[PDB]
RNA sequence: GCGCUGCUGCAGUUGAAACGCCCGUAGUUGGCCCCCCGCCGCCACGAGGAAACGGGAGCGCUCCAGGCAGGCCCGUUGGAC
C-alpha cells in the first residue's frame, strides 16, 4: 500500500527532470509536500507549482528548469541534536557549500543552515542539491 | 434528617456484622470508640475519614460506605508518599488486589531506534472503587503492605466496551 | 479484488464535483423520506433503495437533496437493520456454501471458498464489535448461523 | 559492608573545593562531628597550615591549638579536625586578626577580615521548628544549635542574629520577595542576588528565582538560599560583590596578573 | 441602526406587494462603486435564497450607488477540543475556518455553481487562489468580478481572481 | 585490516542462499483532512549529584615523560571550565 507520499513525489520529479521534461503531476497532496516545494522554490530549483482541488486526493503541477541533481527522503525520522548536524552534512551532501538538508522542528520546517543559526535541533525530513 | 438517615445505616450495619457468626473476628474501625452506637442521639460521629492531600478528592462511597479496610487510604491507617503513576488494569482476581500494566519505551543507541517494554505492578484496591480489565488507574506509593505490594489505588477512569487493546504510555 | 485474491481491477464509480441538486429537481427533502419509509417497510436493502431512486426518480445522489445518507435517515426513523447489510450477505453466502457442501463433501474448492468467507466475516465482525455498532456478546458460530440469519433478517 | 562507622578518608575521595594536592599523600584529615557536616565544612588545620601558613606540619598545628591560640565563636578549640563552616567567626588575638568565613564566587571558603563592632554576633538559618519535652517550643539552625522559646513571628527558612557572648535572638529577617540573599550550595555558590519569584510543587522541591545586581538571573533550590539582610547585607562581604565572571574575563585577569 | 438599514428595510416593506436581516456591511472597491453585504441569519439563508436574484436586482434598482450581496453569518471556533478539566468538548467540523471560507465563497456567487478551485504558488508573489466558473455564463458576471474579489479579500484576507473555463 | 556480520553499510536468476501454495494470531507497519485545549514521545535550557582518568586555561621541573606550582611591587597570586 501507499505510505510515503513525499518519496513518490520526489522520485517522479527526478524521473521527469532526467529526460528534460517541463511539467510533472504528483497525485496526492499534503502540507509537508507543499512546504518542501516552497523551500525548493525559494532556493531556486523548481520555479512555480499549482495545487488542484478535487475534494479527495488533491493533485499538484510543478514546472521544472533543470538545476536539480538529486532529491530524497529519510524514512525513519531521526532526532538530530543541534550539535550533531555536521556529521550528517558530511555523510549526505557532496560539499559543505551548496547542499540543503530539511528538518522539522517546533519552530517549523527549515534548513540546516537556519537551524545552526538558531542553535536548535529536531527531526530530519530529506535533502536536495 | 439527612444526617439521621446516615447514622441509622451506619448503626444498622454494625449489627448484621455481629450477626454474621460464620466470621471468626469482629472487624471495627480503630479510630472509633465502640460505645457511640448505643447513643440514640446523633451527637457523635460513627465513621472516620481523611483527605489524601495531593489535590485528590475523597469519594462519596468511602464517606457513606459501610466497609472496614485497614489498608484503604481514605478510611484506613496508611499514608500516601512518594511517586504517583498511571497504568491500565491487567487482572482483577484477588480479594482486594489488582495487577497494573505499565508501558514505556527503551532507546538503543547503536540502531537509533526504540523498543516497547512493559512491567506488571501489583496494588491494593479498596472496596470504594469498581474496576474491570482495561480501566485506567492512578496509584500512590505506600509502605510495604505485603510481599509484592507497595501501591494503593486512588483514582479510576472507566474504559468503554470491546475497546481495542492499545499501547498506552503514561 | 485484492484481499483474498490476486486480481486488481479498478471498476468503481466517480461522483460529480458539485454537490448541488439537479436543475430539474422537483422533490423537497421530505418527499424522498416518505419514499424511503415505504420502500424499507417492504424489506428493501439500502443499496437497492439507491438504485430504485436513481433509476425511477432521477436522483443521482440522496445526500445532495437531503444532506444526509440513507442509513442515517433510517436510523433517525428507527428502521435500520440491527445487523449491517454487508455482513448479513456474507453470512448468507456462507450458509449457502455449507448447505451445498453437506449435500456432497468431495468438493474441495468449496471448502477453500468457505474458509475465505469465514475469515472475512470474523474480521468485519471484530471491527463492528469495536466502534460499538454491535453488542459485545455478538459472535458468529457455524452451526447456529442460519438461526441468526432468520431472526436478524 | 563495614561493621561500623568510618574513621579514615582517602585524599582522592575528599571534596574538590578543599583544593588538596594529589601528591600530598594517601590520606586527608577526617573532620569530627560538630556544628557542620563533612561536605559543608573545612578542617581547622587546612586553614591554619595550607592557607595562613603559620604552621608547616600537623604537629605544629597541634601545639598551637593545645596552647589555646584560636577562638571559634568565642570558645577555644583544641581539635585540629574541628569543622569550620559558613558565617563563622575566626579570631586570633595574638595577632589581632579577625576573619569571618564566607564563600567566594568560585565556590570555596574564604576569610573576610572584620571589625570589632560586628564580631559579637553571627547569622544563622532556621530550618526546623519542633516541640520538645513537655511540649516546649524549640528551634534549630544550620550550625547545630537549639534555642528554646522562640518568638512566634519566626518561621522556617528565616535568618536569625544571635550575640556570640549570649545565645539570645535580637532581630530576624523573613524569607520574602525582595530580600538580598546569598547562595551556599550547588553550581552557584558565592553568588549574591535578590529574590524575584517563588514556585512550590506539592511533595517535591521549591525553586527560587534570583536576579543579580547586573541583571543576570539564576535558579536554585530553597535548601541552599541564605538571607543576609533586608536589601543590603548585614555583614562585611568579600571585595567582589558576588559576581562570577565568564571564562573570557577570568582569562584576561589572569593574563593581566601574569 | 444606521442609515443604509433604514432605506433597505423600507424597500423590503415595499417589495412584498416574514423574513428579517441581521446587519449590513459595506466594502469599498477601486472604482467609486462599492458593495453592500447583507448578513442573513443562518436558519433563513435558504429562505432568502430561492428568489433572491430578483431581490438583489430590485434592491440595486431602488438605491443605486453599490451592488448588494446576501450572505449568512457563521461562527468560527478556535479549538478542536475544549478541556473543562473533567471531560472534553469536541468542536463540530462546521465551525472550522476552512469550511466557513468555502461556504462564503459559494454564497457570494450562489446562483452560479463553482466548477473548480486552484491555488498558485509563484516564486516571489504571495500565493493566490483562482476559481473556475461555467463557460456558459459570462457577460452576466463579467462586470461583477472585481467586487467579488474585493469582498472575498475583505471577509477573508486570502486574495483571489476570477476566470471562466 | 573487513562494506568477510553490513544501523550508517553486504548478498539472495546462473557463484552460498526466496518456505510448494493459501488462511492466520502475537509482532511490525499503516492514505488525506481541523491553527492554537490536555496527555506521550521529541528539541533547547536549567537544577541536583565524588574525585581520579579524558579534554582543556596559566605556569621554562635546564627540555621531556610530568607536577600544580610560583613571583615579588602578585585577581583576596593561582589551581578556571
Ligand atoms: Mg493479506
Ligand atoms: Mg490498484
Ligand atoms: Mg560475501
Ligand atoms: Mg549449480
Ligand atoms: Mg546457487
Amino acid at each position: 500500500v501507499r505510505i510515503n507520499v513525499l518519496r513518490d513525489a520526489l522520485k517522479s520529479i527526478c524521473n521527469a527532470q532526467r529526460i528534460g521534461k517541463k511539467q510533472v503531476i504528483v497525485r496526492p497532496s499534503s502540507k509537508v509536500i507543499i512546504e518542501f516545494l516552497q523551500l525548493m522554490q525559494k532556493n531556486g530549483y523548481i520555479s512555480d507549482f499549482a495545487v488542484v482541488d478535487n475534494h479527495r486526493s488533491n493533485r499538484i503541477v510543478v514546472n521544472l528548469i533543470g538545476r536539480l541533481n538529486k532529491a530524497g527522503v529519510i524514512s525513519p525520522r531521526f532526532d538530530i541534536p543541534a550539535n550533531d548536524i555536521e556529521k550528517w552534512v558530511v555523510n549526505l551532501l557532496p560539499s559543505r557549500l551548496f547542499g540543503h538538508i530539511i528538518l522539522t522542528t517546533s519552530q517549523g520546517i527549515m534548513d540546516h543552515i537556519e537551524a545552526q543559526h538558531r542553535q536548535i535541533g529536531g527531526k530530519v525530513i530529506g535533502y536536495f542539491y | 434528617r439527612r444526617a439521621l438517615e446516615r447514622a441509622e445505616t451506619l448503626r444498622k450495619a454494625a449489627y448484621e456484622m455481629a450477626e454474621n457468626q460464620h466470621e471468626r473476628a469482629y472487624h471495627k474501625q480503630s479510630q472509633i470508640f465502640q460505645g457511640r452506637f448505643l447513643r440514640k442521639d446523633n451527637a457523635r460521629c460513627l465513621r472516620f475519614y481523611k483527605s489524601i492531600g495531593m489535590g485528590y478528592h475523597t469519594p462519596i462511597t468511602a464517606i457513606n460506605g459501610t466497609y472496614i479496610d485497614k489498608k484503604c487510604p481514605f478510611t484506613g491507617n496508611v499514608s500516601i508518599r512518594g511517586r504517583i503513576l498511571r497504568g491500565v488494569v491487567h487482572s482483577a482476581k484477588m480479594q482486594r488486589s489488582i495487577i497494573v500494566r505499565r508501558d514505556y519505551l527503551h532507546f538503543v543507541q547503536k540502531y537509533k531506534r526504540y523498543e516497547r517494554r512493559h512491567k506488571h505492578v501489583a496494588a491494593h484496591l479498596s472496596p470504594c472503587f469498581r474496576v474491570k480489565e482495561g480501566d485506567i488507574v492512578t496509584i500512590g506509593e505506600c509502605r510495604p503492605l505485603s510481599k509484592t505490594i507497595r501501591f494503593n489505588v486512588i483514582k479510576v477512569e472507566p474504559v468503554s466496551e470491546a475497546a481495542k487493546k492499545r499501547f498506552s504510555p503514561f | 479484488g485484492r484481499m483474498h485474491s490476486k486480481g486488481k481491477g479498478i471498476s468503481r464509480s466517480a461522483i460529480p464535483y458539485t454537490r448541488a441538486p439537479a436543475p430539474w429537481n422537483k422533490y423537497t427533502p421530505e418527499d424522498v423520506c416518505e419514499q424511503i419509509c415505504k420502500l424499507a417497510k417492504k424489506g428493501t436493502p439500502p443499496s437497492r433503495i439507491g438504485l430504485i431512486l436513481r433509476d425511477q426518480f432521477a436522483i443521482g445522489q440522496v445526500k445532495n437533496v437531503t444532506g444526509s445518507k440513507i442509513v442515517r435517515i433510517l436510523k433517525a426513523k428507527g428502521l435500520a437493520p440491527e445487523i449491517p447489510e454487508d455482513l448479513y450477505c456474507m453470512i448468507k453466502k456462507a450458509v449457502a456454501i455449507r448447505k451445498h457442501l453437506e449435500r456432497s463433501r468431495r468438493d474441495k474448492d468449496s471448502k477453500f471458498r468457505l474458509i475465505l468467507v469465514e475469515s472475512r466475516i470474523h474480521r468485519l465482525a471484530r471491527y463492528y464489535r469495536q466502534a460499538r455498532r454491535l453488542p459485545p456478546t455478538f459472535r458468529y458460530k457455524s452451526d447456529q448461523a442460519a438461526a441468526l440469519l432468520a431472526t436478524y433478517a | 559492608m563495614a561493621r561500623g562507622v568510618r574513621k579514615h578518608l582517602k585524599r582522592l575521595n575528599a571534596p574538590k573545593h578543599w583544593l588538596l594536592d594529589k601528591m600530598g599523600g594517601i590520606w586527608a584529615p577526617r573532620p569530627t562531628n560538630g556544628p557542620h557536616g563533612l561536605r559543608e565544612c573545612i578542617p581547622l588545620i587546612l586553614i591554619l597550615r595550607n592557607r595562613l601558613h603559620y604552621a608547616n606540619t600537623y604537629a605544629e598545628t597541634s601545639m598551637i591549638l593545645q596552647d589555646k591560640n584560636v577562638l571559634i565563636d568565642g570558645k577555644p578549640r583544641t581539635d585540629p579536625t574541628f569543622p569550620v563552616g559558613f558565617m563563622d567567626v575566626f579570631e586570633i588575638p595574638k595577632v589581632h586578626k579577625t576573619f569571618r568565613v564566607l564563600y567566594d564566587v568560585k565556590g570555596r571558603f574564604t576569610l573576610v577580615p572584620i571589625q570589632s563592632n560586628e564580631a559579637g554576633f553571627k547569622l544563622c538559618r532556621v530550618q526546623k521548628i519542633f516541640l520538645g519535652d513537655k511540649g516546649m517550643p524549640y528551634l534549630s539552625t544550620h550550625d547545630a544549635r537549639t534555642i528554646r522559646f522562640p518568638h512566634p513571628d519566626i518561621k522556617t527558612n528565616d535568618t536569625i542574629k544571635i550575640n556570640l557572648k549570649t545565645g539570645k535572638i535580637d532581630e530576624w529577617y523573613k524569607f520574602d520577595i525582595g530580600k538580598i540573599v546569598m547562595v551556599t550550595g550547588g553550581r552557584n555558590c558565592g553568588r549574591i542576588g535578590t529574590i524575584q519569584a517563588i514556585d512550590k510543587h506539592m511533595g517535591s522541591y521549591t525553586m527560587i528565582r534570583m536576579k543579580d545586581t547586573e541583571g543576570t538571573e539564576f535558579l536554585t533550590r530553597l535548601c541552599n538560599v541564605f538571607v543576609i539582610g533586608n536589601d543590603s547585607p548585614a555583614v562585611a562581604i568579600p571585595t567582589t560583590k558576588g559576581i562570577r565572571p565568564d571564562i573570557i574575563k577570568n582569562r584576561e585577569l589572569r593574563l593581566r596578573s601574569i | 441602526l444606521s442609515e443604509l438599514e433604514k432605506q433597505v428595510a423600507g424597500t423590503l416593506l415595499k417589495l412584498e406587494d416574514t423574513l428579517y436581516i441581521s446587519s449590513v456591511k459595506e466594502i469599498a472597491v477601486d472604482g467609486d462603486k462599492k458593495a453592500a453585504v447583507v448578513y442573513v441569519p443562518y436558519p433563513m439563508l435558504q429562505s432568502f435564497q430561492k428568489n433572491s436574484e430578483a431581490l438583489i436586482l430590485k434592491l440595486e434598482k431602488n438605491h443605486s450607488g453599490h451592488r448588494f450581496i446576501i450572505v449568512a453569518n457563521r461562527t468560527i471556533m478556535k479549538n478542536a477540543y475544549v478541556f473543562t478539566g473533567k471531560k472534553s468538548i469536541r468542536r463540530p467540523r462546521s465551525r472550522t475556518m476552512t469550511s466557513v471560507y468555502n461556504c462564503i465563497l459559494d454564497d457570494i456567487c450562489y446562483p452560479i455553481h463553482v466548477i473548480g478551485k486552484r491555488t498558485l504558488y509563484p516564486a516571489g508573489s504571495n500565493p493566490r487562489l483562482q476559481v473556475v466558473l461555467p463557460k456558459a455564463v459570462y457577460n452576466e458576471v463579467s462586470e461583477r468580478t472585481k467586487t467579488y474579489s474585493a469582498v472575498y479579500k475583505a471577509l477573508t484576507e486570502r486574495d483571489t481572481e476570477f476566470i471562466f473555463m
Side-chain angles (χ1 to χ4, degrees), chain A, chain B residues 2-8 10-170, chain C, chain D, chain E:
Chain A
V1 287
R2 184 187 282 286
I3 284 139
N4 212 318
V5 301
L6 179 68
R7 196 252 196 195
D8 285 334
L10 296 206
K11 283 282 165 133
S12 281
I13 293 294
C14 288
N15 265 89
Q17 184 86 105
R18 213 75 71 65
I19 53 181
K21 276 215 149 315
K22 256 53 180 82
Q23 294 192 307
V24 214
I25 300 184
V26 306
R27 284 168 53 183
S29 174
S30 197
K31 300 131 95 204
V32 188
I33 298 177
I34 290 182
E35 308 307 290
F36 213 88
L37 292 192
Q38 288 212 244
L39 267 193
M40 264 160 128
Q41 177 181 61
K42 274 110 145 183
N43 265 285
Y45 287 82
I46 65 101
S47 299
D48 60 76
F49 49 96
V51 185
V52 189
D53 156 78
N54 55 355
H55 304 312
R56 70 273 204 179
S57 182
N58 292 11
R59 305 174 185 263
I60 307 177
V61 181
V62 75
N63 296 335
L64 306 179
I65 54 167
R67 295 192 164 186
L68 192 55
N69 198 166
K70 195 135 175 47
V73 314
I74 304 300
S75 172
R77 323 303 192 70
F78 304 119
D79 314 310
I80 288 74
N83 68 282
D84 256 318
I85 288 167
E86 76 296 347
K87 320 174 115 81
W88 282 82
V89 161
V90 169
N91 201 246
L92 258 64
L93 294 187
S95 90
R96 311 144 32 89
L97 291 167
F98 62 91
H100 299 291
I101 299 189
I102 312 311
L103 318 157
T104 179
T105 60
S106 51
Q107 315 233 39
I109 312 274
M110 59 212 40
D111 228 23
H112 77 278
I113 299 305
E114 173 74 8
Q116 264 145 1
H117 178 66
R118 298 136 84 111
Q119 256 313 100
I120 59 139
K123 282 150 101 213
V124 56
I125 298 276
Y127 52 93
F128 57 80
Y129 59 85
Chain B
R2 50 297 182 211
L4 270 298
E5 274 134 50
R6 183 162 145 278
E8 289 337 305
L10 286 207
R11 203 193 315 289
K12 177 47 38 203
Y15 282 103
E16 290 98 282
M17 215 207 75
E19 259 274 29
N20 181 8
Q21 271 302 292
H22 182 40
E23 259 319 311
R24 295 184 145 226
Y26 181 87
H27 297 120
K28 53 138 76 176
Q29 220 165 28
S30 102
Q31 293 87 359
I32 298 313
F33 149 67
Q34 219 93 163
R36 301 170 166 195
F37 289 87
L38 320 96
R39 288 171 55 119
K40 293 172 177 169
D41 47 24
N42 216 24
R44 272 285 186 255
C45 88
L46 304 172
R47 184 137 176 114
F48 165 87
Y49 55 95
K50 68 165 78 140
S51 73
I52 290 309
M54 268 286 188
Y56 301 85
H57 286 103
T58 296
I60 300 309
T61 46
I63 317 171
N64 308 1
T66 59
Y67 67 87
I68 313 294
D69 189 15
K70 61 174 199 167
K71 294 168 185 188
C72 172
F74 306 103
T75 64
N77 45 50
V78 293
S79 26
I80 306 291
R81 57 178 169 58
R83 306 166 118 105
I84 312 277
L85 308 168
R86 216 134 49 104
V88 292
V89 187
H90 180 246
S91 100
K93 273 61 164 308
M94 297 163 266
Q95 305 217 16
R96 285 187 178 164
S97 323
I98 60 184
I99 307 282
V100 167
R101 192 176 87 253
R102 290 226 317 149
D103 300 293
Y104 61 102
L105 277 187
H106 187 232
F107 184 79
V108 190
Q109 234 288 318
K110 201 203 156 161
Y111 303 105
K112 295 137 190 62
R113 298 161 155 91
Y114 298 88
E115 336 181 354
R116 302 186 173 94
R117 289 179 166 186
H118 84 278
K119 296 238 212 212
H120 285 345
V121 164
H124 174 84
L125 174 79
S126 164
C128 56
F129 297 106
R130 216 79 41 63
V131 195
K132 37 137 175 53
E133 262 146 346
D135 277 70
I136 299 114
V137 287
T138 329
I139 57 179
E141 178 164 299
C142 54
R143 69 166 179 270
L145 300 177
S146 75
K147 187 175 172 173
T148 63
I149 291 181
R150 295 96 172 76
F151 283 95
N152 229 314
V153 175
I154 60 186
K155 191 189 306 170
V156 186
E157 313 310 18
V159 169
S160 278
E161 56 172 10
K164 45 216 298 203
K165 190 270 316 283
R166 179 161 316 101
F167 180 82
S168 37
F170 276 139
Chain C
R2 275 260 316 283
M3 196 145 95
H4 283 157
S5 199
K6 221 129 67 168
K8 43 204 97 195
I10 59 176
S11 297
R12 298 169 92 274
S13 305
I15 51 174
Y17 173 95
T18 327
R19 288 129 186 192
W24 36 267
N25 186 29
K26 49 160 297 306
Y27 307 76
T28 238
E30 305 335 332
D31 319 71
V32 307
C33 277
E34 291 48 35
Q35 302 272 351
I36 302 185
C37 177
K38 68 216 313 187
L39 283 168
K41 244 69 87 173
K42 288 168 69 264
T44 313
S47 326
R48 320 302 294 291
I49 286 177
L51 283 174
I52 285 156
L53 255 41
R54 164 246 269 178
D55 280 349
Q56 269 184 32
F57 283 96
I59 304 183
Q61 301 287 101
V62 158
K63 195 206 195 344
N64 285 3
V65 174
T66 76
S68 89
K69 318 227 252 164
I70 312 193
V71 177
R72 177 110 176 193
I73 298 162
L74 299 174
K75 172 136 92 83
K77 257 158 60 203
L79 268 77
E82 40 248 53
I83 307 302
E85 311 82 301
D86 36 29
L87 186 78
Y88 172 93
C89 299
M90 279 210 267
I91 297 182
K92 282 201 299 247
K93 184 159 292 269
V95 170
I97 301 277
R98 291 191 155 288
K99 165 173 182 201
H100 163 85
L101 269 182
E102 64 92 335
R103 304 178 43 272
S104 86
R105 66 106 193 117
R106 255 187 266 185
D107 196 2
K108 310 251 186 52
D109 184 38
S110 290
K111 296 168 186 130
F112 186 65
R113 302 284 154 196
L114 184 64
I115 292 171
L116 303 179
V117 181
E118 316 259 62
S119 303
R120 241 180 283 130
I121 279 158
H122 285 313
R123 287 217 239 158
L124 196 53
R126 159 180 335 137
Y127 160 75
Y128 275 135
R129 255 181 288 118
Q130 308 161 350
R132 309 83 153 290
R133 173 60 181 80
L134 279 173
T137 74
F138 181 91
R139 249 193 101 161
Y140 171 74
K141 306 277 270 151
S142 55
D143 67 343
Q144 321 192 228
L148 308 204
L149 211 47
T151 85
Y152 283 133
Chain D
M1 221 268 284
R3 295 176 261 159
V5 297
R6 317 258 183 183
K7 281 144 51 170
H8 296 68
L9 179 62
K10 290 289 207 342
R11 158 104 51 164
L12 285 168
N13 200 34
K16 194 31 169 48
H17 55 323
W18 288 6
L19 285 160
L20 263 82
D21 56 325
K22 187 174 100 220
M23 277 298 169
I26 293 293
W27 303 107
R30 177 66 178 238
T32 64
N33 296 12
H36 311 97
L38 207 155
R39 257 59 195 230
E40 39 245 49
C41 86
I42 183 169
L44 210 36
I45 174 147
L46 297 189
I47 301 169
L48 253 167
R49 183 185 61 174
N50 313 111
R51 215 79 40 101
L52 310 168
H53 279 314
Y54 291 99
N56 282 340
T57 40
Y58 208 93
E60 277 137 59
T61 304
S62 60
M63 338 186 72
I64 295 159
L65 294 174
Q66 82 181 35
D67 298 0
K68 268 78 144 53
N69 301 343
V70 66
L71 283 303
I72 315 291
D73 295 305
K75 287 254 270 149
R77 310 309 192 157
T78 187
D79 194 16
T81 55
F82 186 82
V84 177
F86 185 70
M87 221 96 62
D88 208 331
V89 177
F90 203 116
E91 67 248 77
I92 308 155
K94 183 154 312 302
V95 189
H96 329 315
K97 327 196 84 172
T98 341
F99 308 110
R100 193 187 288 287
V101 192
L102 287 193
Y103 277 124
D104 69 322
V105 286
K106 311 239 180 295
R108 297 108 74 151
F109 277 117
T110 50
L111 316 183
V112 172
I114 58 179
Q115 290 299 337
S116 308
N117 73 332
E118 75 143 2
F121 76 93
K122 82 193 312 199
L123 292 330
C124 294
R125 187 185 142 92
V126 25
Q127 52 220 0
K128 195 205 220 225
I129 298 280
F130 62 106
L131 295 179
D133 307 295
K134 304 160 156 51
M136 257 150 222
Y138 271 98
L139 154 147
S140 164
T141 83
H142 80 295
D143 39 8
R145 158 196 316 266
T146 54
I147 290 94
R148 191 158 130 257
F149 289 134
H151 205 300
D153 279 23
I154 305 180
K155 294 288 167 246
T156 319
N157 302 303
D158 293 10
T159 286
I160 301 293
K161 204 178 140 290
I162 61 99
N163 170 222
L164 264 192
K165 298 281 161 258
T166 86
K168 320 280 292 300
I169 293 98
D170 316 23
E171 41 83 56
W172 57 84
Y173 318 86
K174 282 214 70 69
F175 193 89
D176 216 4
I177 301 191
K179 310 270 210 124
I180 185 173
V181 285
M182 171 141 177
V183 164
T184 38
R187 266 253 286 280
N188 298 287
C189 277
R191 286 168 77 120
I192 285 93
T194 47
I195 301 182
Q196 321 267 135
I198 306 176
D199 311 285
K200 323 183 248 151
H201 307 82
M202 289 202 266
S204 215
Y205 305 106
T206 296
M207 314 288 333
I208 297 297
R209 210 162 44 80
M210 296 141 307
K211 185 157 129 286
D212 207 357
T213 193
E214 293 168 54
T216 316
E217 270 227 37
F218 51 111
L219 285 94
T220 209
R221 30 180 75 164
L222 172 69
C223 89
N224 39 25
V225 167
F226 202 120
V227 182
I228 58 172
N230 266 283
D231 309 38
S232 174
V235 288
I237 66 183
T239 41
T240 194
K241 289 90 194 57
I243 303 302
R244 182 193 310 269
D246 70 338
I247 36 163
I248 303 176
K249 268 278 304 315
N250 191 73
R251 206 207 165 213
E252 190 32 22
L253 279 142
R254 186 94 288 257
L255 288 173
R256 183 191 76 196
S257 153
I258 271 290
Chain E
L1 206 63
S2 174
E3 59 307 320
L4 287 122
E5 299 84 308
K6 310 176 197 328
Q7 319 103 334
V8 307
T11 295
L12 271 147
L13 297 149
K14 309 299 143 308
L15 309 177
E16 46 273 65
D17 209 6
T18 326
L19 285 293
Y20 187 69
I21 72 180
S22 78
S23 298
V24 187
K25 186 59 211 97
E26 175 134 41
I27 288 89
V29 190
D30 56 59
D32 266 13
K33 260 277 192 72
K34 334 169 62 181
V37 190
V38 177
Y39 290 118
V40 157
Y42 198 68
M44 34 179 83
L45 179 68
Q46 324 201 10
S47 299
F48 315 81
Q49 215 145 42
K50 277 158 295 331
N51 292 334
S52 64
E53 233 59 52
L55 191 133
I56 307 328
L57 169 43
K58 300 215 296 187
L59 209 48
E60 193 41 302
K61 183 204 57 32
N62 185 172
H63 175 255
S64 56
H66 34 261
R67 305 145 217 271
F68 286 72
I69 291 294
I70 288 183
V71 309
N73 47 353
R74 306 156 163 98
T75 173
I76 295 177
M77 300 171 43
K78 72 170 320 193
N79 262 311
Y81 283 79
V82 175
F83 194 52
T84 181
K86 277 61 57 165
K87 53 154 50 53
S88 306
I89 324 295
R90 167 133 197 70
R91 175 184 59 194
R93 276 268 199 159
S94 40
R95 308 290 199 286
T96 45
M97 188 183 42
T98 81
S99 292
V100 165
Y101 289 178
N102 303 3
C103 297
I104 289 172
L105 182 58
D106 230 17
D107 256 3
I108 290 179
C109 49
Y110 59 97
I112 315 115
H113 275 0
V114 159
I115 307 291
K117 309 190 207 175
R118 315 203 252 251
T119 149
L120 331 174
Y121 285 79
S125 155
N126 216 271
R128 60 158 189 295
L129 156 138
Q130 73 145 310
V131 333
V132 191
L133 288 183
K135 190 52 52 55
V137 288
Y138 178 97
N139 40 58
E140 325 68 36
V141 207
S142 54
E143 79 290 42
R144 44 207 289 99
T145 46
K146 271 65 57 199
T147 165
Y148 285 176
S149 301
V151 297
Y152 207 57
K153 157 66 66 47
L155 307 161
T156 77
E157 325 328 334
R158 293 187 324 181
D159 86 85
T160 164
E161 61 85 338
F162 278 88
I163 62 139
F164 291 80
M165 182 198 219

